[PDB]
Amino acid sequence: MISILHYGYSFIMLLGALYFYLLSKDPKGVPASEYLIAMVIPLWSGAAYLSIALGQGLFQYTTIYYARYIDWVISTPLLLAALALTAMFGGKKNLTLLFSLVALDVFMIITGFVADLSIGTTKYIWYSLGVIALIIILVITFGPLRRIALSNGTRLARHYTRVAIYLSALWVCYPTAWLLGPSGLGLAQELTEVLVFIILPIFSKVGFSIVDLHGLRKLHQ
Amino acid sequence: MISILHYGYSFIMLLGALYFYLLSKDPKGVPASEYLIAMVIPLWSGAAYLSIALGQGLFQYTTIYYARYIDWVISTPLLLAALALTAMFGGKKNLTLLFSLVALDVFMIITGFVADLSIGTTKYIWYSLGVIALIIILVITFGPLRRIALSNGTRLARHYTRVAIYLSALWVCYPTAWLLGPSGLGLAQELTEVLVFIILPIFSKVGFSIVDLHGLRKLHQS
Amino acid sequence: MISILHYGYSFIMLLGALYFYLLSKDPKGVPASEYLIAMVIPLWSGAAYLSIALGQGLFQYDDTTIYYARYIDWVISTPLLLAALALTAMFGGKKNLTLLFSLVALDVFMIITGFVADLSIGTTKYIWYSLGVIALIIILVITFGPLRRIALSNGTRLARHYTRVAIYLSALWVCYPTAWLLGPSGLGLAQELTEVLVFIILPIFSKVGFSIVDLHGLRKLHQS
Ligand SMILES: CCCCCCCC/C=C/CCCCCCCC(=O)OC[C@H](O)CO
Ligand SMILES: CCCCCCCC/C=C/CCCCCCCC(=O)O
Ligand SMILES: CCCCCCCC/C=C\CCCCCCCC(=O)O
Ligand code: NA
Numbered sequence: 001m002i003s004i005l006h007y008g009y010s011f012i013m014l015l016g017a018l019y020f021y022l023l024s025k026d027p028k029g030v031p032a033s034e035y036l037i038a039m040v041i042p043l044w045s046g047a048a049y050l051s052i053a054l055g056q057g058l059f060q061y062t063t064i065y066y067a068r069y070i071d072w073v074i075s076t077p078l079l080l081a082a083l084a085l086t087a088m089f090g091g092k093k094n095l096t097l098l099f100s101l102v103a104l105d106v107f108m109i110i111t112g113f114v115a116d117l118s119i120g121t122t123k124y125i126w127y128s129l130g131v132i133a134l135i136i137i138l139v140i141t142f143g144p145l146r147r148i149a150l151s152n153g154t155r156l157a158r159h160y161t162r163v164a165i166y167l168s169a170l171w172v173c174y175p176t177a178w179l180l181g182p183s184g185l186g187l188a189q190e191l192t193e194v195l196v197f198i199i200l201p202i203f204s205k206v207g208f209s210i211v212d213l214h215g216l217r218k219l220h221q
Numbered sequence: 222m223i224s225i226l227h228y229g230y231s232f233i234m235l236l237g238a239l240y241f242y243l244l245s246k247d248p249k250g251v252p253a254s255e256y257l258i259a260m261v262i263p264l265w266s267g268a269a270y271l272s273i274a275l276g277q278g279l280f281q282y283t284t285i286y287y288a289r290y291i292d293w294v295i296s297t298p299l300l301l302a303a304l305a306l307t308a309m310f311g312g313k314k315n316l317t318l319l320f321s322l323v324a325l326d327v328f329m330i331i332t333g334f335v336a337d338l339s340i341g342t343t344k345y346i347w348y349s350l351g352v353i354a355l356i357i358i359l360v361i362t363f364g365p366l367r368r369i370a371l372s373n374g375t376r377l378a379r380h381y382t383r384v385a386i387y388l389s390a391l392w393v394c395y396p397t398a399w400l401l402g403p404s405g406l407g408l409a410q411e412l413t414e415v416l417v418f419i420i421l422p423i424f425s426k427v428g429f430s431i432v433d434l435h436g437l438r439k440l441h442q443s
Numbered sequence: 444m445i446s447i448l449h450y451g452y453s454f455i456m457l458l459g460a461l462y463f464y465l466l467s468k469d470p471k472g473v474p475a476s477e478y479l480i481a482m483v484i485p486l487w488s489g490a491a492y493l494s495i496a497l498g499q500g501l502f503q504y505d506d507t508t509i510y511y512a513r514y515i516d517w518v519i520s521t522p523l524l525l526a527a528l529a530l531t532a533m534f535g536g537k538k539n540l541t542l543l544f545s546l547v548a549l550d551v552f553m554i555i556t557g558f559v560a561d562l563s564i565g566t567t568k569y570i571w572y573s574l575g576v577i578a579l580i581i582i583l584v585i586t587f588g589p590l591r592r593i594a595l596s597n598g599t600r601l602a603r604h605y606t607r608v609a610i611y612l613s614a615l616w617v618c619y620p621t622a623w624l625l626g627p628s629g630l631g632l633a634q635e636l637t638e639v640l641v642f643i644i645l646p647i648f649s650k651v652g653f654s655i656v657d658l659h660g661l662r663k664l665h666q667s
């Protein structure tokens with residue numbers, strides 16, 4: 001079941017990528033960079049998840065689905081880049097703030113991987129550092145980044161706020177599932193966690209970009 | 222023999238690097254970035270191949286020359302960057318298209334590594350995904366990227382087209398040799414593969430940049 | 444003692460990071476990028492050194508202990524330090540990102556040769572070490588040659604500051620390959636504990652010290 005679920009995930013990522021490619025061909029005032037980011041996220045995630053489907057992206061240590069971290073260490077900084085470019089749509093870019101989010105995010109995913117490789121108190125030290133990174137990401141998202149979105153007009157700010165809540169709601173689920181699952185307290189079953197880390201990312205990756213791109217395109221007319 | 226051949230490769234990379242450094246001192250309207258890229262490619266490749274010569278960049282799994290993938294994952298995106306900056310010479314840059322090529326290329330090399338670590342059907346799934354990335358790279362090269370080259374005038378477009386064909390011809394040899402060699406169908410002997418992945422990269426790396434830089438320098442006024 | 448020393452290091456990195464954050468809130472004409480770089484260096488290093496403190500960022504190889512977390516630290520922290528140095532030289536003028544990325548490329552190569560040298564034995568070790576030293580020399584040639592000339596093109600006051608930070612960085616950085624060669628990873632003249640203290644004290648000056656000196660100098664160029 002776990003293999004088939006991952007094949008399914010990868011096929012959905014492939015379909016998402018193709019949809020974003022088709023949209024890119026009639027861009028409606030949205031820059032090519034946004035479409036490129038939208039395509040890389042699912043294609044890379046699809047590849048990583050394909051490795052799990054093929055029985056490669058995991059080892060016994062509990063099962064570590066290490067391919068998930070290879071996925072997220074690329075896909076999640078690109079998602080924050082997407083979020084940051086949305087806030088900045090129609091205005092001056094702040095690449096300093098954007099790379100601040102990328103740095104926090106890459107650190108967050110790494111602490112997760114290290115936490116998964118750790119045992120006892122050490123595991124939760126790393127996990128806790130990852131959660132602290134996420135909180136700071138959310139502080140930036142609803143603080144200075146949102147203020148940039150507001151500086152770019154009511155219609156853009158409305159859209160940014162929607163995508164900001166969408167992203168934030170999904171992202172807090174990841175460390176919650178991690179803590180509950182085999183990598184953490186072990187209250188939730190492996191199969192339950194596998195389904196969560198199949199369904200969440202479909203919404204976090206393809207869902208997010210459908211909502212993000214459609215909203216930005218709608219600002220054209 | 223395999224060790225000595227790799228020492229030779231590294232010495233040629235070193236010579237190439239120094240030649241590009243000397244050219245950079247009298248740039249003839251070619252930007253420093255092009256000279257930097259031209260030097261990094263062979264220096265990094267030389268280092269990677271030196272590790273093979275010293276017996277470090279390979280393990281038994283059949284022999285995997287993993288240092289080749291460490292080489293290519295840096296050297297091949299830089300080569301496409303070089304190609305893209307050539308198309309854009311004299312005009313506005315399209316870094317989106319450039320990073321599209323970098324992303325495709327890094328994926329291509331990784332699928333190769335994963336394919337080399339795989340057995341049976343799984344190997345050829347990864348290989349096939351790598352080939353699909355290469356096809357898209359070539360489609361970009363002769364499609365949108367060439368159209369940018371054409372927007373920058375007759376003489377630049379002529380040069381870009383030459384370098385584009387040079388690169389494309391060499392690059393399709395890599396997945397061909399891979400499939401024929403021990404990593405694939407195993408028709409070719411290890412020594413045969415080692416020689417191909419010594420001679421190809423000399424032309425793909427040092428050869429390419431001699432052709433690319435000389436062509437751009439020839440466009441210089443006064 | 445080695446664990447406690449690393450905990451101490453990480454706490455000092457954390458304090459440095461917070462100080463640079465507070466400075467960033469009243470920037471005095473210094474761009475946000477400089478403050479971001481100043482914070483990333485110690486935070487990343489603190490993380491890497493925390494792994495050593497917890498007993499994770501090291502393994503036994505050739506009977507010697509390899510502190511592999513130091514290389515994970517440096518491969519990110521040292522290119523960011525040269526970026527900081529390069530942006531100082533370019534302060535008030537056109538940027539040269541080609542020269543900046545030249546330094547980043549040399550630096551990342553340097554740290555990798557170090558790691559490979561640490562994993563190597565006999566002549567092979569010193570081939571890698573030697574390539575790393577050659578990278579450092581070229582970095583220093585850039586620092587006192589073309590990069591300094593960019594600093595001079597941005598006026599007397601900036602060039603004076605750049606030269607100070609350039610000497611500060613250079614003096615600290617030549618110590619790293621010296622300690623490495625003398626210590627367990629090299630000739631084995633110096634004891635593990637000696638090396639551990641060197642690679643605790645040097646980086647406090649190389650990371651937090653450097654940025655205090657760099658940022659204070661740039662801020663002092665502001666007229667309020
Ligand atoms: C094993 C893998 C190792 C990978 C190693 C990765 C190193 C990360 C750092 C790179 C240098 C950062 C470059 C900084 C670019 C300069 C920023 C700039 O242009 O500044 C503009 C201005 O200062 C703002 O207002
Ligand atoms: C694990 C894989 C890591 C790969 C990292 C990327 C390798 C290096 C290639 C980067 C491409 C650099 C292109 C620079 C564009 C310069 C454009 C300009 O001159 O304005
Ligand atoms: C592993 C070692 C190499 C990794 C880093 C490679 C860096 C070299 C690549 C590209 C150089 C980018 C130059 C950007 C030019 C912008 C214009 C300018 O201001 O000069
Ligand atoms: Na966006």
Ligand code: NA
Nearest residue numbers: 303304306307
């Ligand atoms: Na070029």
Ligand code: NA
Nearest residue numbers: 527528530531
């Ligand atoms: Na600086």
